[PDB]
Design a protein around this ligand. Structure first.
Ligand SMILES: O=C(O)CNC(=O)C(=O)O
Ligand code: NI
Length: 437
């Protein structure tokens, strides 16, 4: 009989200490009045401005719209990827940084100082966690250094299509069992929970279970207005969590140390520069000339081409143009990444021209093909996929406000583009060439 425990159970606290000690609870009374007020107003102000969107994610080969509406706020340039969906931050006024609106801007600043507070609290609890055990400081710091927060909202009246928690009888899930993805290893998660206005169905909870385990009773922690909780250290790997919906509207701010080593603007721009190092860059025009046809440089060039195409452009435009409502931060850089990408289409075309010329001895030609074939095939496949993902029956359900675009995309007739969008014919011919005997 799979069951769960709440504070009403005799064994709840002992079971908390024994099998969920890296979960920590900070009651609303630990956070100042003024911060509570400011943070709640910020939630209401972002909601009023319609800044929260259910995400069209992908899970086990299926297109699925998250019951919760969400918004990512964090360090300018930074991204958070989950369920094959890359969220772009609406930026908060971090040091040394004209893109958002008055009220919206104010709300970001507010979640910034909320971030400062939780980070200090996270550091305290981690120091205490280390002090308990055995009965570096830089590790701690880095594992409390929240660079983003994913805000969640749900009005169970307006979103009643909630699944039943299937293992412990926790009732309705606002967010189903999961691990938070794309997180720096052993990094903490801090959560401020704002409700309006077995377990009490009417009240929001966060649920926890041990991974692989539905025999250990799950824990259901009641959240009220301003209660925060923290997942410390490896809790997020060793356990799964969910959100059990109550009956009133509720928000949360989930601060994370996103693992953005390949997930920031500066990083992708640097990779684009790396790739274009192989092109004569005296002038910006269509006659792309390449400096080298060394297998490794061409492989890299085509790989980066794929990276900016599908991890940045197609992602951004698939959700888009939707965070344009809250900010114009990404307009210019996404245009730039597209200009850099269009050049890479020029580069690919120049590689194809080089393989397709008379003088090239068969041996070097085959070198080139082998270096670029994996990338071009991944290009065709990821293009089919994204194009389908933009045209699914549920993408088309979304308002024009959030209509997914399949950009960049062009027809055959389009003279402005050197290569067709569909590479089936090209990839087929390269395969045949490599098979030539
Ligand atoms: O909203 C909460 O309390 C918990 N949030 C999540 O688990 C999440 O969005 O990943
Ligand atoms: Ni989560």
């Amino acid at each position: 009989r799979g069951s769960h425990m709440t504070p009403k159970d005799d064994e709840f606290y002992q079971q908390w200490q024994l099998k969920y000690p890296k979960l920590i609870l900070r009651e609303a009374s630990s956070v100042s009045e003024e911060l509570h007020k400011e943070v709640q107003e910020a939630f209401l102000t972002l909601h009023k401005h319609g800044c929260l969107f259910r995400d069209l994610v992908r899970i086990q080969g299926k297109d699925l719209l998250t019951p919760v509406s969400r918004i990512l706020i964090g360090n300018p340039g930074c991204t958070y990827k989950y369920l094959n969906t890359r969220l772009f931050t609406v930026p908060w006024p971090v040091k040394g940084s004209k893109h958002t609106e008055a009220e919206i801007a104010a709300a970001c600043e507010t979640f910034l100082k909320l971030n400062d507070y939780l980070q200090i609290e996270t550091i305290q609890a981690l120091e205490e966690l280390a002090a308990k055990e055995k009965a570096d400081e830089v590790d701690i710091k880095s594992r409390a250094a929240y660079n983003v927060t994913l805000l969640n909202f749900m009005d169970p009246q307006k979103m009643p299509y909630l699944k039943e928690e299937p293992y412990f009888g926790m009732g309705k899930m606002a967010v189903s069992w999961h691990h938070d993805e794309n997180l720096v290893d052993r990094s903490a998660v801090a959560v401020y929970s704002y409700s309006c206005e077995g377990r009490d169905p009417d009240i929001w909870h966060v649920g926890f279970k041990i991974s692989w385990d539905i025999e250990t009773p799950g824990l259901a922690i009641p959240l009220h207005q301003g209660d925060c909780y923290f997942m410390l250290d490896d809790l997020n790997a060793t356990h799964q969590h969910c959100v059990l919906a109550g009956s009133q509207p509720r928000f949360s701010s989930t601060h994370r140390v996103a693992e953005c080593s390949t997930g920031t603007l500066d990083y992708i721009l640097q990779r684009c520069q790396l790739a274009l190092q192989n092109v004569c860059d005296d002038v910006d025009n269509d006659d792309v000339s390449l400096k080298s046809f060394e297998p490794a440089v061409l492989k890299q060039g085509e790989e980066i081409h794929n990276e900016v195409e599908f991890e940045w452009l197609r992602q951004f435009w698939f959700q888009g143009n939707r965070y344009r409502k809250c900010t114009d931060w990404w307009c210019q850089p996404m245009a730039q990444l597209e200009a850099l990408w269009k050049k890479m289409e020029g580069v690919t075309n120049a590689v194809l021209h080089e393989v397709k010329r008379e003088g090239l001895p068969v041996e070097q030609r085959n070198e080139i093909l082998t270096a670029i074939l994996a990338s071009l095939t991944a290009r065709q496949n990821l293009r089919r996929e994204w194009h389908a993902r933009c045209q699914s029956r549920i993408a088309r359900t979304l308002p024009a406000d959030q209509k997914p675009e399949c950009r960049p995309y062009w027809e055959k007739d389009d003279a402005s583009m050197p290569l067709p969008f569909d590479l089936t014919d090209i990839v087929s011919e390269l395969r045949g060439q490599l098979l030539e005997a």
